[PDB]
């Protein structure tokens, strides 16, 4: 699965960045979901005030 | 950090792709913080109207 020396170690390091960047965007998504349930419930309230 | 011509450039380019996507998600995050500080102050006002 390997043969050197066209970057052995450096290819695994970018494979690590992709798992942090892949998990990073998941938290970002989950924020946009909370902010989305919040704006959903605020809208609901702005209606009961009308 | 590379060895040619076994895709010297193509490993360096994707190594580049990861640096923009990392700054990219950083700007995306910065928006979700503003829209959230914004919805926070809008909420504050919808409360002062109630």
């Amino acid at each position: 699965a390997i043969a050197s020396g066209v970057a052995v170690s450096k290819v695994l390091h970018l494979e690590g960045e992709v798992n942090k960047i892949k998990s990073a965007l998941l938290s970002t998504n989950k924020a946009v979901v909370s902010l989305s349930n919040g704006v959903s419930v605020l809208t609901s309230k702005v209606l009961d005030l009308k | 950090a590379i060895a040619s011509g076994v895709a010297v450039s193509k490993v360096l380019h994707l190594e580049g792709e990861v640096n923009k996507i990392k700054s990219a998600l950083l700007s995306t995050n910065k928006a979700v913080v503003s829209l959230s500080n914004g919805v926070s102050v809008l909420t504050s006002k919808v409360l002062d109207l109630k």
Binding site: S27, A31, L35 | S36
Partner: peptide, 23 residues
């Protein structure tokens, strides 16, 4: 209203985790 603010509280906590990974 107090619950709309917990949604913003927990969305802002999700960005600091995102940014805690960058990195």
């Amino acid at each position: 209203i107090s619950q709309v603010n917990e949604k913003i509280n927990q969305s802002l906590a999700f960005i600091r985790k995102s940014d805690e990974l960058l990195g």
